[PDB]
Design a protein around this motif. Structure first.
Motif, PDB file in Angstrom:
ATOM      1  N   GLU A 126      -2.551 -27.738 -14.226  1.00 40.69           N
ATOM      2  CA  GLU A 126      -1.666 -26.600 -14.497  1.00 40.69           C
ATOM      3  C   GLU A 126      -1.005 -26.012 -13.250  1.00 40.69           C
ATOM      4  O   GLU A 126       0.177 -25.676 -13.281  1.00 40.69           O
ATOM      5  CB  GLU A 126      -2.451 -25.485 -15.178  1.00 40.69           C
ATOM      6  N   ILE A 127      -1.785 -25.840 -12.179  1.00 44.24           N
ATOM      7  CA  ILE A 127      -1.262 -25.282 -10.930  1.00 44.24           C
ATOM      8  C   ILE A 127      -0.242 -26.230 -10.298  1.00 44.24           C
ATOM      9  O   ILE A 127       0.808 -25.788  -9.838  1.00 44.24           O
ATOM     10  CB  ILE A 127      -2.405 -24.883  -9.923  1.00 44.24           C
ATOM     11  N   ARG A 128      -0.549 -27.530 -10.303  1.00 43.05           N
ATOM     12  CA  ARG A 128       0.388 -28.560  -9.864  1.00 43.05           C
ATOM     13  C   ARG A 128       1.690 -28.553 -10.685  1.00 43.05           C
ATOM     14  O   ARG A 128       2.776 -28.491 -10.119  1.00 43.05           O
ATOM     15  CB  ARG A 128      -0.264 -29.935  -9.919  1.00 43.05           C
ATOM     16  N   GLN A 129       1.561 -28.606 -12.005  1.00 44.99           N
ATOM     17  CA  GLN A 129       2.704 -28.567 -12.911  1.00 44.99           C
ATOM     18  C   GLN A 129       3.572 -27.307 -12.785  1.00 44.99           C
ATOM     19  O   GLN A 129       4.778 -27.421 -12.739  1.00 44.99           O
ATOM     20  CB  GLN A 129       2.262 -28.779 -14.361  1.00 44.99           C
ATOM     21  N   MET A 130       2.957 -26.129 -12.717  1.00 45.76           N
ATOM     22  CA  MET A 130       3.698 -24.868 -12.603  1.00 45.76           C
ATOM     23  C   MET A 130       4.397 -24.728 -11.261  1.00 45.76           C
ATOM     24  O   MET A 130       5.547 -24.280 -11.199  1.00 45.76           O
ATOM     25  CB  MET A 130       2.786 -23.664 -12.834  1.00 45.76           C
ATOM     26  N   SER A 131       3.707 -25.122 -10.184  1.00 44.59           N
ATOM     27  CA  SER A 131       4.204 -24.863  -8.834  1.00 44.59           C
ATOM     28  C   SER A 131       5.188 -25.912  -8.386  1.00 44.59           C
ATOM     29  O   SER A 131       6.042 -25.630  -7.552  1.00 44.59           O
ATOM     30  CB  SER A 131       3.053 -24.762  -7.826  1.00 44.59           C
ATOM     31  N   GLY A 132       5.057 -27.131  -8.920  1.00 47.02           N
ATOM     32  CA  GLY A 132       5.865 -28.262  -8.436  1.00 47.02           C
ATOM     33  C   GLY A 132       5.417 -28.769  -7.063  1.00 47.02           C
ATOM     34  O   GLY A 132       6.117 -29.570  -6.444  1.00 47.02           O
ATOM     35  N   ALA A 133       4.252 -28.307  -6.589  1.00 46.92           N
ATOM     36  CA  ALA A 133       3.682 -28.767  -5.326  1.00 46.92           C
ATOM     37  C   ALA A 133       2.663 -29.890  -5.553  1.00 46.92           C
ATOM     38  O   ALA A 133       2.000 -29.910  -6.589  1.00 46.92           O
ATOM     39  CB  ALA A 133       3.030 -27.598  -4.560  1.00 46.92           C
ATOM     40  N   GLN A 134       2.526 -30.803  -4.589  1.00 49.38           N
ATOM     41  CA  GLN A 134       1.392 -31.714  -4.607  1.00 49.38           C
ATOM     42  C   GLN A 134       0.178 -31.030  -3.993  1.00 49.38           C
ATOM     43  O   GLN A 134       0.253 -30.478  -2.897  1.00 49.38           O
ATOM     44  CB  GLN A 134       1.688 -33.041  -3.895  1.00 49.38           C
ATOM     45  N   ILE A 135      -0.930 -31.045  -4.724  1.00 51.00           N
ATOM     46  CA  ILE A 135      -2.115 -30.323  -4.325  1.00 51.00           C
ATOM     47  C   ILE A 135      -3.313 -31.275  -4.363  1.00 51.00           C
ATOM     48  O   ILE A 135      -3.629 -31.856  -5.410  1.00 51.00           O
ATOM     49  CB  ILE A 135      -2.367 -29.066  -5.209  1.00 51.00           C
ATOM     50  N   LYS A 136      -3.963 -31.441  -3.212  1.00 45.95           N
ATOM     51  CA  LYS A 136      -5.078 -32.376  -3.079  1.00 45.95           C
ATOM     52  C   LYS A 136      -6.348 -31.658  -2.617  1.00 45.95           C
ATOM     53  O   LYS A 136      -6.348 -30.916  -1.616  1.00 45.95           O
ATOM     54  CB  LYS A 136      -4.737 -33.520  -2.097  1.00 45.95           C
ATOM     55  N   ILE A 137      -7.436 -31.897  -3.336  1.00 46.71           N
ATOM     56  CA  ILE A 137      -8.743 -31.342  -2.957  1.00 46.71           C
ATOM     57  C   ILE A 137      -9.420 -32.340  -2.015  1.00 46.71           C
ATOM     58  O   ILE A 137      -9.532 -33.524  -2.354  1.00 46.71           O
ATOM     59  CB  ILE A 137      -9.632 -31.084  -4.210  1.00 46.71           C
ATOM     60  N   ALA A 138      -9.868 -31.854  -0.852  1.00 42.43           N
ATOM     61  CA  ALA A 138     -10.552 -32.711   0.119  1.00 42.43           C
ATOM     62  C   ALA A 138     -11.906 -33.148  -0.420  1.00 42.43           C
ATOM     63  O   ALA A 138     -12.529 -32.448  -1.228  1.00 42.43           O
ATOM     64  CB  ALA A 138     -10.722 -32.000   1.465  1.00 42.43           C
ATOM     65  N   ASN A 139     -12.341 -34.311   0.029  1.00 37.97           N
ATOM     66  CA  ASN A 139     -13.685 -34.818  -0.236  1.00 37.97           C
ATOM     67  C   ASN A 139     -14.702 -33.768   0.128  1.00 37.97           C
ATOM     68  O   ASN A 139     -14.581 -33.133   1.182  1.00 37.97           O
ATOM     69  CB  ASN A 139     -13.941 -36.082   0.592  1.00 37.97           C
ATOM     70  N   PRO A 140     -15.701 -33.554  -0.739  1.00 37.56           N
ATOM     71  CA  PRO A 140     -16.713 -32.558  -0.390  1.00 37.56           C
ATOM     72  C   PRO A 140     -17.646 -33.049   0.731  1.00 37.56           C
ATOM     73  O   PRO A 140     -17.914 -34.245   0.817  1.00 37.56           O
ATOM     74  CB  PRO A 140     -17.491 -32.362  -1.694  1.00 37.56           C
ATOM     75  N   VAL A 141     -18.101 -32.131   1.587  1.00 35.86           N
ATOM     76  CA  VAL A 141     -19.097 -32.457   2.625  1.00 35.86           C
ATOM     77  C   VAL A 141     -20.365 -31.630   2.438  1.00 35.86           C
ATOM     78  O   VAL A 141     -20.294 -30.433   2.186  1.00 35.86           O
ATOM     79  CB  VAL A 141     -18.569 -32.338   4.124  1.00 35.86           C
ATOM     80  N   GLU A 142     -21.517 -32.277   2.563  1.00 36.27           N
ATOM     81  CA  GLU A 142     -22.809 -31.598   2.405  1.00 36.27           C
ATOM     82  C   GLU A 142     -22.997 -30.462   3.434  1.00 36.27           C
ATOM     83  O   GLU A 142     -22.699 -30.629   4.620  1.00 36.27           O
ATOM     84  CB  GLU A 142     -23.977 -32.595   2.491  1.00 36.27           C
ATOM     85  N   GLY A 143     -23.464 -29.321   2.942  1.00 34.69           N
ATOM     86  CA  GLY A 143     -23.722 -28.140   3.770  1.00 34.69           C
ATOM     87  C   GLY A 143     -22.501 -27.400   4.309  1.00 34.69           C
ATOM     88  O   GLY A 143     -22.605 -26.661   5.303  1.00 34.69           O
ATOM     89  N   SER A 144     -21.345 -27.608   3.677  1.00 32.61           N
ATOM     90  CA  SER A 144     -20.163 -26.802   3.964  1.00 32.61           C
ATOM     91  C   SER A 144     -20.226 -25.565   3.084  1.00 32.61           C
ATOM     92  O   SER A 144     -20.919 -25.563   2.069  1.00 32.61           O
ATOM     93  CB  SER A 144     -18.883 -27.585   3.675  1.00 32.61           C
ATOM     94  N   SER A 145     -19.531 -24.503   3.470  1.00 33.84           N
ATOM     95  CA  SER A 145     -19.455 -23.305   2.614  1.00 33.84           C
ATOM     96  C   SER A 145     -18.131 -23.242   1.840  1.00 33.84           C
ATOM     97  O   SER A 145     -18.026 -22.520   0.837  1.00 33.84           O
ATOM     98  CB  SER A 145     -19.634 -22.038   3.443  1.00 33.84           C
ATOM     99  N   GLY A 146     -17.141 -24.005   2.313  1.00 27.61           N
ATOM    100  CA  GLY A 146     -15.784 -24.016   1.761  1.00 27.61           C
ATOM    101  C   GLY A 146     -15.272 -25.432   1.527  1.00 27.61           C
ATOM    102  O   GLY A 146     -15.751 -26.379   2.156  1.00 27.61           O
ATOM    103  N   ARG A 147     -14.313 -25.564   0.611  1.00 27.32           N
ATOM    104  CA  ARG A 147     -13.649 -26.819   0.324  1.00 27.32           C
ATOM    105  C   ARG A 147     -12.165 -26.738   0.709  1.00 27.32           C
ATOM    106  O   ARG A 147     -11.447 -25.805   0.301  1.00 27.32           O
ATOM    107  CB  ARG A 147     -13.769 -27.142  -1.158  1.00 27.32           C
ATOM    108  N   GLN A 148     -11.725 -27.714   1.501  1.00 27.50           N
ATOM    109  CA  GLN A 148     -10.355 -27.785   1.969  1.00 27.50           C
ATOM    110  C   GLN A 148      -9.441 -28.298   0.875  1.00 27.50           C
ATOM    111  O   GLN A 148      -9.847 -29.166   0.076  1.00 27.50           O
ATOM    112  CB  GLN A 148     -10.235 -28.718   3.174  1.00 27.50           C
ATOM    113  N   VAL A 149      -8.221 -27.739   0.879  1.00 27.85           N
ATOM    114  CA  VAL A 149      -7.130 -28.066  -0.039  1.00 27.85           C
ATOM    115  C   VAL A 149      -5.804 -28.180   0.767  1.00 27.85           C
ATOM    116  O   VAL A 149      -5.435 -27.262   1.534  1.00 27.85           O
ATOM    117  CB  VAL A 149      -6.970 -26.990  -1.165  1.00 27.85           C
TER     118      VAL A 149
END
Length: 74
Positions: A30-53
């Motif tokens: 939905e966010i991709r479709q509405m915004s018209g932006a390409q949006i990629k979630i980074a691979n998760p890493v063990e013991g991180s507090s945040g996820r990169q986008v």
């Protein structure tokens, strides 16, 4: 436009990434479709507090995508 395309990056707190993605990826779709932006979630890493986008598109569509990400977290 070709000259308008750029890349942006942000971090979603881990406890919030499931909300951004949604059931079967429905929310992030939905966010991709509405915004018209390409949006990629980074691979998760063990013991991180945040996820990169990363978000690619014009400044306008990146700003819209960021706004929608925020809205989804309310």
């Amino acid at each position: 436009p070709l000259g308008s395309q750029t890349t942006h990056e942000l971090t979603i707190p881990n406890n919030l990434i499931g909300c951004i993605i949604g059931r079967q990826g429905a929310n992030i779709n939905e966010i991709r479709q509405m915004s018209g932006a390409q949006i990629k979630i980074a691979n998760p890493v063990e013991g991180s507090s945040g996820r990169q986008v990363t978000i690619t598109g014009s400044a306008a569509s990146i700003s819209l995508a960021q706004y929608l990400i925020n809205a989804r977290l309310s």
